[PDB]
């Protein structure tokens, strides 16, 4: 996902996409006349967002799909081994703290 933010106008920095921000707006529209002659090149940059946007849209859903299998499968088996290793850690401080208070209890008997 990662969209629908405020974003206006974050990184003011007009990005000069086909340099259409540079050519129409920043070279023929330098002192606020245009963007009306340049607004046509902005809607033309929206058609260019449909052709550039369609072009990237083709490559958007293009890389697929084989397999990331053991991402899920090793997520499952490694999650179960993560549960058993968590049993080894809770067991580790179980017997470990058991010895700690055990010989700290016989060491409290040394107190």
């Amino acid at each position: 996902v990662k969209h629908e933010p405020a974003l206006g106008q974050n990184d003011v920095f007009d990005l000069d996409p086909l340099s259409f921000d540079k050519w129409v707006p920043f070279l023929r529209r330098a002192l606020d006349k245009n963007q009306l002659d340049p607004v046509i090149d902005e809607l033309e940059n929206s058609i260019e967002d449909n052709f550039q946007g369609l072009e990237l849209q083709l490559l958007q859903d293009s890389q697929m799909n084989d397999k990331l299998e053991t991402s899920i499968d090793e997520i499952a088996n490694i999650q179960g081994m993560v549960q058993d290793t968590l049993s080894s850690e809770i067991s580790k401080f179980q017997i470990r703290l058991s010895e700690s208070a055990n010989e700290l209890i016989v060491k409290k008997q040394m107190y």
Binding site: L59, N65, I72, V82, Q83, E89, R96, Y111
Partner: protein, 104 residues
């Protein structure tokens, strides 16, 4: 030294307090499999049906998109293949990555 002689209960129980700090490391370990394995189960179930929809592409739309031309005719492939002697003889960098390679 001059009076500290009972150091076993205090340095060793302080080491057991360090083991209680290492019991807080066991809280970092149960926290480790808790947060990490929670991300494992959560992203796992979160993206298993993403593998069922990527599988819907990768099984149904895969061999569906393959067997589009299960029967397809004789002259038309010469026509658009000749149009890929148009487009394949435009170079690579004009045409582009999956443009060129997918026309291949």
């Amino acid at each position: 030294m001059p009076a500290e002689i009972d150091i076993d209960e205090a340095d060793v129980l302080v080491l057991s307090q360090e083991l209680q700090k290492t019991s807080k490391l066991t809280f970092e370990i149960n926290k480790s499999l808790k947060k990490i394995a929670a991300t494992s189960n959560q992203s796992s179930q979160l993206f298993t049906p993403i593998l069922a929809r990527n599988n819907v592409l990768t099984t149904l739309q895969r061999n569906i998109e393959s067997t589009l031309n299960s029967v397809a005719s004789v002259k038309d492939l010469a026509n658009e293949a000749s149009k890929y002697e148009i487009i394949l003889q435009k170079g690579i960098n004009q045409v582009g990555l999956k443009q060129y390679t997918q026309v291949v």
